[PDB]
C-alpha cells in the first residue's frame, strides 16, 4: 500500500480511502466489520464516513457500525484516521427543519455531538463539511470548529463539494488568527467528470489541501457497466471498455488507478461492498497505467484543465 | 411561515420571533406551554426570553417555564433558537447591589449559569445584552462571551437597546481578534417610534446584524387602543395631539378592512433590515392573529398613508442636517 | 482666548474656529490672529485662493494657523463624494489655490456610504506620507460612521478622524443622540456648524425692527436674554462652549465688532440659572438608546 | 446612460466600457463617448492605443479629468507579473498616456509563478507615489481573486476592484467560480468580448447580407437570430443587454468606432429584455451555474 | 458608601477595600466573619487577601477563613469581589524551593488551585501578582492567566508592587492578542511615602488601572503614633513630620488614622485604600473616614509636612 | 576611543557624545579634533547651535559622512510640544539650518502628555520613509513613556525609540528607579545629560577662590576623596557614569582642546572597587522601583 501526506499537514494516509457508504444500507454490520478488518491488514488507515450514511430512517447507522467496530478493541480506533461529515439533514428526507442542515454554529454543534455518540469515540480526526454553505460566514464556521478543536473533540477540518474560492476564503480566514485551515477537499472527480480540474483542484494545491475523489467510478459507469440512455456517453463508455479489453484491464481498477496519477490527488474513496471488492481495489493501487493507455484515455475522456485557460486563455 | 437569515450569519430564523414576557406574569405555565407548542406548529423556531422576565420576586420564572417545556422531550430544545438576556438586576426591584446588574465580566458569569440552570439546558443559542453598558469596555465584554463560547455554553451574541456606534465598536473590537461579533440587535422600533432608523438600523445593516423589533405595538397603542376605549399607552392617549395620530391610524385601517394589531407587525416586516417583530401572545388565538399578520400584504396606498400619519426621521446625518 | 486640545490629539486650537472680495478678509484674518485665533477653516474656491493670497503676504501666516479645508461637491461622476479619484483631484486643486504645500486638517464634507473606508484611508495615507496632509476630520457624519472610520484606521496604525463638524445649536440638538457620543468615545473634537441656526439664534426677532411655534421659541429666548442683560448671538456661542465634547463653534466675523462680539462670547460665563432656562426653551433629546426607549 | 458602482468601491462608472479595436477618428469617438456620458476608458478590447489616448488628453478641455482611465500590463521578465515587469510596464505606460496617474491598473492575466506579497509590494509602491489609484485583474480564476484580496486586506490595502473576464451568451463558464468569487469579494465584473468576437453580432445574416463551420454551433446561432427576428431586436444589442441582467456584471467592453456603433451600444444599455426573451435566450445558450453544483451537487 | 469603577473596567467596587491579613493571625475566625458581615452591611464588596496571609507555618489560613465565611451561605460569595494573590512562598520561610515563589506559569498553576481549595469557591474575581518578577516574560505570564480565565477560574488580573513600565509592558502585551490586561495596581502609597506618584500612578492612570493603596497608615506610623505612646522611627526627622501631623490634626480635632485614609481618597487615580480592621470598631472607624471631608486648608498643611515628588521626569529633571 | 552599540540597534557610537558648546570657528576646531579622537556621535542639546554644524558640514572632507547627527524638536499654540504639526515644522527648520538632507537621530525634547503615540509615530514615520530621518530617540521621558512609545511602534512594525537622554549624574540618580530600567528592558541607549550636575562634580569648591546648604558637605567628601586618590573631579564624574549598566555614555561640551582631551582621559580611566565603593557611600542611589519605596 502506498502512503502520502494529506496535502501539507503531518498526517500520513493511505492512497486508498475506505468509503463506508454501503455499510448498513447495502452491506451488513458483520461483513462491514470484516471489510474494515481486511482494509487494516492491507495497510489502509484512512476511513471515510458521514452522519447521513445509513439512509432514510437509518441515517446514522454507518457511524454506529464503525462505533461497534471500534468497540471490539484490538487498537482498531487507535489505528484509523477517522473522518466523518456535517451538513446533511439528519431528519426524515426532505425540507429540513431550519438550522438542522447547513453549517451554522448551531447545526455543527448538534451534529458533532450525535456523530461522536454513534461512533463510540471521544474524537473525530477529520471533520469535513459535506458541502459549501454560502449563508454561513467563515468567522462563524471557524468559531464552531475551533471550539471542537480546543476541547480535543476534532483534530483537523476538511471540505467537500466546495468551489476553489471557498477553499481560499476558508484557509485565509483561518490563517489570519492562527488556525489550521482545511487540510483536505473531498470533490467529485473521475474520468467522466473532470471539471474539478478547472479551479477546485488547483486551489486545493495552492493552499496545500489533500484531494480525495468521490464517485471515482462515476456511479459505476466506469465499472464495465455495459456487460449485459443518451447515445453519446454510451459511446464514450463503450470505447473505454473496448480499449481496456485490448489491454487486458478491468474497468473498475483503471478508474481508480487513473485518479492516482492526477496531479495533487491524494487518492480516491473506494466503496467496497464485499472484501473481494476491497481486494480488487487494492490491486488497482499496484496497477501502473502505461503512457499508451493514459494517452488514449485522455482522448476518450478529455479534461478542461485549469481556469481561465479552460474557457478563455 | 417566512424564514430569513439572521443578518450575515448562518442562522435561519422565522420572521416572527416568539417573545415570552407574558409566560408566568400574565399566562400561567400550562397555557404558556400550549402557545409554545403552537408556535412550533406555525413554524416559529426563534424564542426570545430574558432572565428578568417574571417580575419582582418572581424574576426568572419565564425561563423556568421554557425549561419545563423543554423537559417534556420531543425535540423542543433541538428545534428552537433559544435566546435570553443579561444586564438586568435579578435582585429585588430597585437599586441593585454593585456588579449584580449591567455587563461586567462578573455579572455575566453569574447571570449565564443561573439562566442555564433555570432553562434546564446546557447552552443558549442567542445570548443578548439587554442594554448598552457604557462603563464596561469591549475587551472585557468579549473576554466574558468568548469564555462562554469556548466552553460551549453559548453560540451567538446579540445586543438590545444599543446605539449605532455601540454596534460598530463591538463588532470591530471582536473582528480584530477573530471573534464573531454581535449577530442581532433588538431595538424599540414601531410606527409611533421610528428614531431607531436614524443610526441604530443603519449600523446593524452595515455590520450585518439582524434587526429584531421589540414593543412592535408601542405598548398596545397600535393594537386598537382607542377603539378598546369604547402603562405607557395609558396616559399617552391623554395627549390631544397624539390621540389624533392613533385616531387617523384606526380610521384608515377601518376603511381598508384591516386589523390594528396585525398592521403593526406587517409594517415592521416591510422596513429594510428588519428580521421581524417580536410577538407577545397571551393566548393561542393572539398567536394565530400574529401568524396572519406575517402573511398580510400591505399595499402601497396603505404604506403611503401610514408613512404620512407616522413620519420617520430616516438616517442621520440627513435626519437633522442634510 | 481659551485654547483646547483637539479631542485626543496633540493639536492645540482656539475655541473659536474662524470660518467663512479679497482685501477685507485679509485684515479680519490678521486681527483674528491678533485675537489669538489659530484655527482657520474654509467652511468654492475663491475662499481658498483668498487664504492663499493671505499666506503669500509673508509674516508667519502659514506657520501660525491650523489650516483646515474640505472636499468638493454636495454632477459628473467622481467629481463629488469621497472616492480615491475625487479625493486625489480635490486635494491637488486645494493645494494649488491655498498656495501651500500641506493642509493641516483635511475634512470630508459629508458621509459617502458608497465608498469603503479601506479606500478612503488609502487615499489619505498617500497624502500623509507625501506630507500633503497632517490630520483628517469628518463633517456631517453619523456616529457609527466615526466608529467604523477610526476602527478601520487603527487596525493598520493610521491616525483616524481627529474631528467631526456637525450641525449643533440650541434649536437643533439631535447630534446629542449619537454623533457627539461617538465623537467623545473615539476622541474627536466636535466643531459646531451653524452655531446660530442660520442667524435664527442671533437676535432675529428684533432685527424685524427694520411657523408660529418656532418664533415663540425664539421669542422666549430673546425675552429671556433681555431680562438677564445678555446678547443673543453671544449666548448661542457660549451655550455650545459648555456642552461636553464641543471644541468650539465656527464663526466668521467680518467687522471688528463681530470679532470682539465673538471673543466676548468665548469669555462669557453663563450662570446656572440661565442654562436651566435655555434648557426648557430648547430641550435636548439625550443619547440613544435612552432618547427613544430606555 | 446608466451608472453604477464598480463593485464595492466608491468609483462610479458607466455600464458601457469603452475599449479598443489613426488618431482623428479615435479622438472624435472618445469625445462623443464622453458626450454620451461614458466615463470608463480602457485600453483593451495593450503600442499605439496608449499614445492615441495621451494625445487625446493633450487636447485639454478637462478630458483627462473626466475619464476613469484604465490600462493594463518574450525576453525574461518582459512579460508576466514580477515586480520587475510591473515597474517597467507602468512607467512606459505613464509616458505614453501623457498623464501622471492611471486610475485602474489591471493585470492582463494571472501569473502563477509570482506570489501576491511581491505583486502587492509593487502595486502598493505605485499607489503610495500616486501613480495608481485602483488595481484590477483580467483572466483570473475565482480562486486567484480570493487569494489576492485576502492577501491585500491582511495589511489594509485595497484589493482588486474589478475582474475582466470572457463573458457572453455563448461562453458562460465564468459563471462557475470567476463571477461568484468577484461578487463575494466585491469586484466589478467587466465582460470582455461580449459578442464572442462578433459571433453574437448577427454573424449569419452578415454571411449573406469563423466558428460558423460547425453545424452544432451553426444551429445555436440560427436559433438565436431567428428568435430576435421574431422579437424585433438587433442581435448585437441583445448580447450586451443580456449581460447587463447578470448579477455582479458591471458592464461589457464595447469598441464603437463610429457614432452609429455608439448609438447602437447606448441603445443596448437601454433595452429591457422581457422575461419571455430571457427565458428563450437561456434555453438556447444554457449556463452551467455555480460550482460545485455545476458538476457535483 | 461611595463606589467607583475599578479603573477603566465595568467592575464596580467600594472605595474601601477590606484588608484581611489580620484574619487568622491576630483576629480569630469567628470574629473575622463578623467583621466581614459588617463590611457587607456597610457596603464594602472589595475584599482583598493573599495566599501568604497567616504567616510562618500558617500561610493559607486567611484564605480558609473566607472559605468558611462563604460556606455560611447567605449570598456572601455572590456579593463580594474576592481578590487574592500569587508570588510569595507558601512553603517554609526563607529561600524558596525553586519555582515555589515568583511568577513562572508553573508557580501560577499550583498557587491558584491551592488558593481555590482554601477559599472554597470555583473562581477568583481578582487574581493579583504580589510583586514584579523581572525573570518571567509576559507571553509566559499572560498564557497562564489566560488559561485560568478561559477555564472560568479567574475573572480579572491585577498587579501589586510594580513599576510604571511593568504595567505598560504587561497591558500592551495582553492587548496585542486581545486579552484584558491588568485592571488594578496595588501599590504602597501614603502620606509618608509618596514616591508611587513618580511613575507608578501616572502609568496606572494612563492604562486605566484602579489604584489600591496598601499600608495606608505606613505600618501605624500615621495611626496616632506618639499619642498612643502612653516601626521604630526614633529618628528625629520623622517625629517632626509626625508631631506636626498629630498637633495639626489636634489643632483641627481629627483622628490620625482617619485622615491618612481620607487623604488617599483625595489623590487622583486612587480607587481607595485597603483598610485592615482587627475589630468591628476599627471597621466603623474606616467607614467614617470615608465620608470625612478634609478642608482645602488642611490638605495644604499635610502637603508641606509630607511633600510629594510628583511625576517624573519633572520630579528629577524638568 | 571606546565604542558601543546604541542600545539594541546596529548603530555603533563612541562612548562620548559631543554636546553643544555655545563661535563658528572655535566650534569647528573642537569638532574636527573630536573626529580625530574618534568621537563620531554629535548632538545639539537650537538656533545658532545647528547652523554652526551646518557651516561645518559645508567644508566637506567627509564630515557629514563620518558623523551620526542627532538633534531635538508662553509659546504660540503648536510651536512647542510634540503635535504632528510641530514635528514637521521643526524638522524642516532643522534640516535647513543644518545644511544636510537627513538627521540620523531625531530626538524629542521632553515628554508631552497630550499627544498620543499613534499621532507621534505617524509624523516620525513620514520622515523616515522620505529619508529625512533614520532613528528616533527621546529626552526627559518617564520609564512608562519609553515602554508605551515602543510597544506602540512595534504593533505596526516601526523601530521604536533607540535611546533616552536623561538627567543622570552622581548627585541625581533617581533615573535608576524606572527610566534606566525601562530603557534597559526595551533596548535603548541611555544618554546622560548634565553629567557634572551643572558643574557641581568638576571641582566646584576648589575653584571658589547655585547649590550650597546640605549639598556642600557631600561635594567636599567628593573633592577630598579625589585629592587623597589623585583623580580629577570632572573626569571621575564622567567615568562613574560609564560603569553604570545601560549607560551609553555622557554628553560632554568641551570648549577647549584641553577639555576635549580631558573628557577622553575620562573614558579610559578605570575606577577601582574602592573609589566605586566610596563614591556610592558619598552619593547613594535609590535602586529600582518598587524595592526603592516598598520591597
Numbering used by the authors:
A (entry chain D): 1 to 228, 247 to 331
B (entry chain H): 1 to 230, 240 to 331
C (entry chain A): 1 to 20, 28 to 50, 59 to 89, 96 to 231, 248 to 331
D (entry chain G): 1 to 21, 28 to 51, 58, 60 to 86, 96 to 231, 244 to 331
E (entry chain B): 1 to 230, 244 to 331
F (entry chain E): 1 to 22, 28 to 50, 59 to 86, 95 to 230, 246 to 331
Article excerpt on this structure:
Aldo-keto reductases (AKRs) are a superfamily of oxidoreductases capable of reducing carbonyl to primary and secondary alcohols, found in all phyla. In this work, we identify the enzyme AKRtyl, which is responsible for tylosin reduction. Phylogenetic analysis indicates that AKRtyl is the founding member of subfamily D within family 12 in the AKR superfamily. Specifically, by combining steady-state and transient kinetics, X-ray crystallography and molecular dynamics simulation, we demonstrate that AKRtyl exhibits a positive synergy mediated by an unusual Monod-Wyman-Changeux (MWC) paradigm of allosteric regulation at low concentrations of the cofactor NADPH, but an inhibitory effect at high concentrations is observed.
To obtain the apo structure of AKRtyl, we remove the carried cofactors by denaturation and refolding. The first apo structure is similar to our previous second purified-state structure, with two octamers in an asymmetric unit and one active (R4) and one dormant (T4) tetramer per octamer (R4T4). Unlike the classical MWC model where different conformational equilibria occur in the actual oligomeric state, AKRtyl is actually octameric, but we observe symmetric T and R conformational equilibria within the tetramer. We therefore propose that the basic unit of MWC-type allosteric ensemble is a tetramer rather than an octamer for: (1) The tetramer exhibits ligand-independent T and R conformations, suggesting that the equilibrium between the T and R conformations occurs within the tetramer.
